[PDB]
């Protein structure tokens, strides 16, 4: 919760490219996979999201799973900017 706000913005950005997040249940971990922040801070951020609308959460096999809802996509656009016709995983990139 007491997050240096730069690290939080990276997590949001990384969330929006994927539209998805696979965080461990591993506190005390020095750094997260892919993102350059502690795993605990990503889980605090995805805890903070789940409460105020968004973000469909599971906790199976020590792995949290977070997908962004329709209102989740709207608020992540508000935090970052990106207006319309963008990444997440709501639709395909081209042909795959």
């Amino acid at each position: 919760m007491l997050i240096p706000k730069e690290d939080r913005k990276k997590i949001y950005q990384h969330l929006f490219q994927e539209g998805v997040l696979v965080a461990k249940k591993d506190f005390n971990q020095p750094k997260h996979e892919e993102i350059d922040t502690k795993n605990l801070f990503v889980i605090k951020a995805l805890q903070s999201l789940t409460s105020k609308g968004f973000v469909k959460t599971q906790f199976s096999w020590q792995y949290y799973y977070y997908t962004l809802t329709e209102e989740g996509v709207v608020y992540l656009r508000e935090y970052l900017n990106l207006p319309e016709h963008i990444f997440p995983a709501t639709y395909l990139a081209g042909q795959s």
Binding site: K25, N28, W61, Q62
Partner: protein, 53 residues
């Protein structure tokens, strides 16, 4: 954020967690399962392990 928040837990009981529950009691590491025998006992048939003899 604090400096000393970690004893060296490379080995032993405290390091070896399970994949499922997060337990340090009756942990199958054989064939690299990393599963507490009670969750294994639940899912054993799913993981290919069957009771024959």
């Amino acid at each position: 954020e604090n400096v000393w928040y970690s004893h060296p837990r490379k080995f032993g009981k405290g390091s070896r967690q399970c994949r499922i529950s997060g337990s340090h009691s009756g942990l199958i590491r054989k064939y690299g399962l990393n599963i507490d025998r009670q969750s294994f006992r639940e899912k054993a048939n799913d993981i290919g392990f069957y009771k024959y003899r």
